[PDB]
């Protein structure tokens, strides 16, 4: 299978509105175009851009519909050596 992998070092560089990546559950999402659409606003996303936002994403209690949106932004998996517990 042709899965794309990213190191966290790479993901961390995509930390502004120019190109915004985020890790949730060991996957990388490019949410650049979603910033202006996110119901929770842009700032909560930018504050964790380039980082692992799993804990915040889960703590907010996002709906099943919100979760299903992730397929629009998925760009690859975190490299296995860089996965969080
Ligand atoms: C790709 C990532 C994300 C997607 C697709 C997403 C999607 C959504 C959606 C659909 C809503 C509307 C409410 C719902 O359906 O549950 C929402 C609201 C909200 N989101 Fe997100 N979200 C993402 C990431 C985040 C993150 C990382 C945070 C916090 C750091 C956050 C904070 C909030 C807040 C505060 C609201 C409104 C208040 C609430 O729903 O309790 N979101 N988001």
Keywords:
monomer, 85 residues, binds protoporphyrin IX containing FE, 5-stranded mixed β-sheet, 22% strand, Flavocytochrome B2, Chain A, domain 1, transmembrane, alpha+beta, 4 helices, globular
Structure overview:
It is classed as electron transport. Keywords: cytochrome B5, heme, electron transport. The chain has 85 residues and is of the alpha+beta class. Helix content is 24%, strand content 22%. It has helices at 8-11, 43-46, 54-60, 64-68, and strands at 5-6, 15-16, 19-24, 27-30, 74-78. The protein has a five-stranded mixed β-sheet. The protein is globular. The structure holds protoporphyrin IX containing FE. Protoporphyrin IX containing FE binds at residues 29, 31, 38-40, 44-45, 48, 53, 56-57, 60, 62-63, 65-66, 69-70, 73. Residues 29, 31, 38-40, 44-45, 48, 53, 56-57, 60, 62-63, 65-66, 69-70, 73 line the site of protoporphyrin IX containing FE.
């Amino acid at each position: 299978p042709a899965v794309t992998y990213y190191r966290l070092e790479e993901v961390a560089k995509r930390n502004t509105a120019e190109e915004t990546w985020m890790v949730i559950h060991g996957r990388v999402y490019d949410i650049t175009r979603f910033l202006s659409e996110h119901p929770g606003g842009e700032e909560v996303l930018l504050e964790q851009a380039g980082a692992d936002a799993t804990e915040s994403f889960e703590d907010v209690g996002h709906s099943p519909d919100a979760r299903e949106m992730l397929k629009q932004y998925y760009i690859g998996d975190v490299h296995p050596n860089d996965l969080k517990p």
